[PDB]
Amino acid sequence: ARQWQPDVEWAEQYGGAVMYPTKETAHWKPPPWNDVDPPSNLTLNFGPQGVLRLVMELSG
Amino acid sequence: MMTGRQARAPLQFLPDEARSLPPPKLTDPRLAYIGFLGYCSGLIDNAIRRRPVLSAGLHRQFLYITSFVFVGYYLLKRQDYMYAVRDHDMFSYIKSHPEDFPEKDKKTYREVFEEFHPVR
Amino acid sequence: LQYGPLAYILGEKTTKKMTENSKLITVDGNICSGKSKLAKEVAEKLGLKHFPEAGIHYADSTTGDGKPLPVRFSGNCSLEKFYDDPKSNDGNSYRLQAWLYASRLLQYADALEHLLSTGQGVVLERSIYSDFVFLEAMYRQGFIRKQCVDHYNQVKKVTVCEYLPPHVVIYVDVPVSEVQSRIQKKGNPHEMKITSAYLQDIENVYKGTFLPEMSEKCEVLQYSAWEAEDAEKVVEDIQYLKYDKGPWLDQDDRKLHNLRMLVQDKLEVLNYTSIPVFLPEVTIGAHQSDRVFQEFTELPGRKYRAGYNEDVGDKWIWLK
Amino acid sequence: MMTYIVFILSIIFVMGFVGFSSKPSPIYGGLGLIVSGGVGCGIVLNFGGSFLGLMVFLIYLGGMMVVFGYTTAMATEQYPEVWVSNKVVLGTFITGLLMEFLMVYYVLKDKEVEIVFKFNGMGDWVIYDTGDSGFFSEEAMGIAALYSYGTWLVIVTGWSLLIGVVVIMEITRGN
Amino acid sequence: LLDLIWLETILPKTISLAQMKMSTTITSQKGLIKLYFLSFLITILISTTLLNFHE
Amino acid sequence: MSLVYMNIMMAFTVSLTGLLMYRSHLMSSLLCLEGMMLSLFILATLMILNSHFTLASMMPIILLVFAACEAALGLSLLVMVSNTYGTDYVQNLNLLQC
Amino acid sequence: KFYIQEPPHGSPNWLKVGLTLGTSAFLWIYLIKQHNEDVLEYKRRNGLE
Amino acid sequence: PLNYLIGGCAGGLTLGIGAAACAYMGLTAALVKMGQLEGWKVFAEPKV
Amino acid sequence: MNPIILIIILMTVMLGTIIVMISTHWLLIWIGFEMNMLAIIPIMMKKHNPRATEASTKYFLTQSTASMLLMMAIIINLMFSGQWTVMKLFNPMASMLMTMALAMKLGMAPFHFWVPEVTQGIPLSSGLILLTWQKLAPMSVLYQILPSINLDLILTLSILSITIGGWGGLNQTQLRKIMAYSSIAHMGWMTAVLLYNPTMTLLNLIIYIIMTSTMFTLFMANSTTTTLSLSHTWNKAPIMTILVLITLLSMGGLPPLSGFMPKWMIIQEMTKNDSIILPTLMAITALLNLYFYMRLTYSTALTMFPSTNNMKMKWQFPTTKRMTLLPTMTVLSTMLLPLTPILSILE
Amino acid sequence: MNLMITLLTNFTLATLLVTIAFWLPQLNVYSEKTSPDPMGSARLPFSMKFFLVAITFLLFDLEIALLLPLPWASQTTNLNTMLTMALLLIFLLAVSLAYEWTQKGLEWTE
Ligand SMILES: CCCCCCCCCCCCCCCCCC(=O)OC[C@H](COP(=O)(O)OCCN)OC(=O)CCCCCCCCCCCCCCCCC
């Protein structure tokens, strides 16, 4: 009645990974907002090769 | 185009021969337009940092105007110099090749026949 | 700014002020655990700057004249209306929770900025690391929807990864019976409408989800209702810790310079709180946002940048 | 036969890149590039470029391809291959390399001599010993002039190597 | 019929249909670096042999 | 033109075609790129020694040093890729499609 | 006072304002001197006196 | 020009979408014919 | 990153471009490109996330291939000329290789396939450097070798760059990929007028860098990376709302704005040389750029507005960000058209 | 020529000793043995430190490649420039070493 300012359905169709969702572009999710993406150590067995076995959680 | 002219004396913003040309007046409309661009940059600078646009930073607006006029004066000097070099090279090449630039015999319209196309 | 990369060049290194007392300590507990006195007690024993709990009007207290603004400009949400109807139509639950998450994010930014600009430690009450424990406890009560939990996890995933965990997490064990005893003895007529299972789910997400994941990234100190009454035992537990876990140990001047440049830029701290993920509890239309913004501009001291308001008595404006 | 030797090495050089531009593995790719570096170094050394050939060995092969094999060996998780007794573990290697030299000798056929004999270089190509030079390798003194004449070149090269150290230490940090 | 359909079909909408089909055949790249350098080599083998741009 | 120069150019184009058709790995790309650098070294060296142009003899070493430093940079990039995915596969490098 | 925290621009930075006005006045007086020297050089090279 | 307009529409009927490709290829072949007549240069030599 | 190391690396980027700009020798051209790439690789990895490593890997591969093709062109020039002056090339094979290599360094189509990726992977200031400062050195080499550049090849690359940078801007909500396809289209515009008047090449370059720098400075001032995130600018900083969009109305090429200054002048130099069809087609494709970028303008100044409630908190904090030269660059990217004959300073 | 003959003879003696070392105990019909170490089925974790010392080798090896023509450059006429550039290259190698020092690059293999 006053001046047309949108529905939210108009704003949601200017989002996503692509403007126009085609068949190959429908599964493309949008990238993260801060542009970062969600991404152990070595374990040796010094065996009997006195005598002693050593299980080593080594970190480099 | 004219890079062979600025190849025997490189990186000269204003050559010495540019001093043989009249400088722009300080009431140049182009220079006053560049000062208007300085005033616009001052108003946009006070607008984008949420300052009172006409009131705040009068020294800052004065330096915007002064800096644009200061750079624009030398830009107008270099503009006038480059178009003077363009016309000087044009006139020297016209004078040095008369056979490539003949004087066309100007015929009056009492000799020139034009096909009349009636409009009806 | 006042602090920048040139200050880092000219020698203002923020490990020079990092002493053994420079500790960020977050006191956590249930709704009426009575920890609000205890944290203040720590602030008068360790010499730390106490920050109170971030309510609706924290950002109002940090800026302007420091007074709380009217609710339409700050929050557009009420704590007492959540106490009255948690399952309300207009969605005051997630709207109040998201505004509290943004207020606690500004509190945590002020905490790290004080700790890195002074070298004086900060005692916080219910920081951003202990905020989802209300949200989950709301979602276990049906007070919000699953899409609200998705929106909050999005905001938390893009905001909490930029920061460090606190040094000491002081947790208070108070069971649901004594919590209800203190709520009924408190006298707030709205707060007494809190159900039992909501407090139980707060305590469950405290004990089963919050504290085990805080146990790897920092050191927690856990107290009951009566041994948290003594401040000296808490301070003796804090001072005789051996800080050995967490990413505070591999912090040189470069990482802490990046963090201090991050937290002083308040719009970069509060950037991803208002991501354009359209959820009906937080989505405001164009006419309402326009009207509230134009009413915000005519508030005293809010028309310009802070040193530039003639209505509140700013001089020398034509030379600034 | 002996005259065309540089040309022969160049043919092997081309075949060497077909060893690894078809890309059987990064490890066999490094092996083929090492063999190609050796034969291209032979091409360089047979024009009197002794210092430049030793820069191929010392800096390209022994300096950089060591690092390529080192970084490759810190990736591309290995798996065993055929390990029967000596009729497979070395006999197939010798028959395969004999077929490789068979392929080297096999390309010098009638489609090659129409290019070799119509455009005979050996007889008039290798002209580095055209007259006398004196008591000095001209190539050695040209490399020696890097310090007297190449002041700007050494400045921008050493600055690029210092910036290379700084750039590697900044991007390989993760923080 | 003529303005709301046909002259609305030929001038503003079948041309925009052509541009959106051409862009969705352009902007549908999978991001594979293999296919990008494969298209670069398609460029090299078209231009260096057939198109004769080295002459 | 000449013959052995045509051979070194043939090697350059063969390693270019290997550099323009990726199979599996990023190390294969860096190896084809450094085979290209090797062929540039060989061809520059044969030209500079052929003409007896003395001052350019420092040029292939320059052409080595920078480009070898370039290869070092490439190796470091590969390593960071192999610290994110565990492999140096080029098909893990496809997050920038959107 | 009105503000709960001191703004970075509550007071005029007199060093910055002084350098601003001094640099602007320097550009004005140097511009005027350059224009006077240019019109003198023009009248000396082309003889308009 | 008209004959290559017919040829462009003939290439457009074997393209499909039909009438649009008819008109587009007809106008394009018309421009090819008019470039052959009036000497229109697409990759024009730099002359001034 | 250590700020002293940042200053050293940025001066090394500037030093590599300056070494390409001032050198009379081909080895120093190649050295300056190598120095420029080697120094700009940590600028992309300022944030240390996997998208920056992917972007830097793609950038390294493309720029390294272009550097080796440049050195092959230099080597073939030393065959057929025996010399090293940065001047015209003395073999059209070396001319074609150097034109292809400089088109790869600029990201001109069909070597454009790295430009929207890498600009997506990196921050806004590094994308600003990649789309403004990294154009200056290959355009300088193209300025210095234009008596050998093949006409048909540079026009093919120019119109293919303008068409692909046009049809790349449809399907995008990312601001950085839209700036990348605008980059590709404008490089087609610059290399269209190169063999006719390279002063208009430098005019188009300077106006493009001013408009791109204004747009990236606005994107850094608002910290918005997508169209949908740009759509909240009207409620946070309303003065930021229109300046982005009058600058983008300039970037389309639209009078009376100064972004109409390059393209018109380019047409003004191509109708002199009797090419009427080619600037007509290229500027129809520029109208297609106006089509998609005007749709983005409708997105921000109009329909898709609505806000979220946390924006109310951002009203209590001004921008403490350095908006360096942003009023100056916003005035210089719109109101420069009445000073259009200033272009004679670029001769 | 003599060098190629010498390399070929060294390669032939090497391949002959390897061939004798493989084929002489494979005369034996000893036993075909079965049933195939500190890891059994573990993958290789990457180590950043080994790659840092490899790239440090490569960059200082390039700086050594620049330093190699010094016994020839001592014979030049412009000895002041030659001495300045020699000291400048070794000083830049030392500055690269000091930057490798202070940014903890030489740690846990110091
Ligand atoms: C014939 C002509 C010859 C050539 C003429 C000259 C050509 C100049 C081309 C300029 C290209 C500049 C590219 C950007 C500057 C380079 C360094 C840089 O990126 O500085 C920006 C700086 C980075 O700060 P940072 O902390 O990294 O911000 C990211 C968020 N943390 O800070 C920021 O991000 C703050 C935000 C504002 C940055 C604005 C920078 C604008 C610089 C360009 C001005 C316009 C171009 C010069 C004038 C016209 C000439 C073309």
Ligand SMILES: Nc1ncnc2c1ncn2[C@@H]1O[C@H](COP(=O)(O)O)[C@@H](O)[C@H]1O
């Ligand atoms: N989900 C929630 N429900 C009720 N109160 C909450 C919630 N999340 C945070 N709070 C805050 O926690 C406070 C209770 O702590 P206290 O000040 O100790 O009574 C309330 O006044 C709210 O400001």
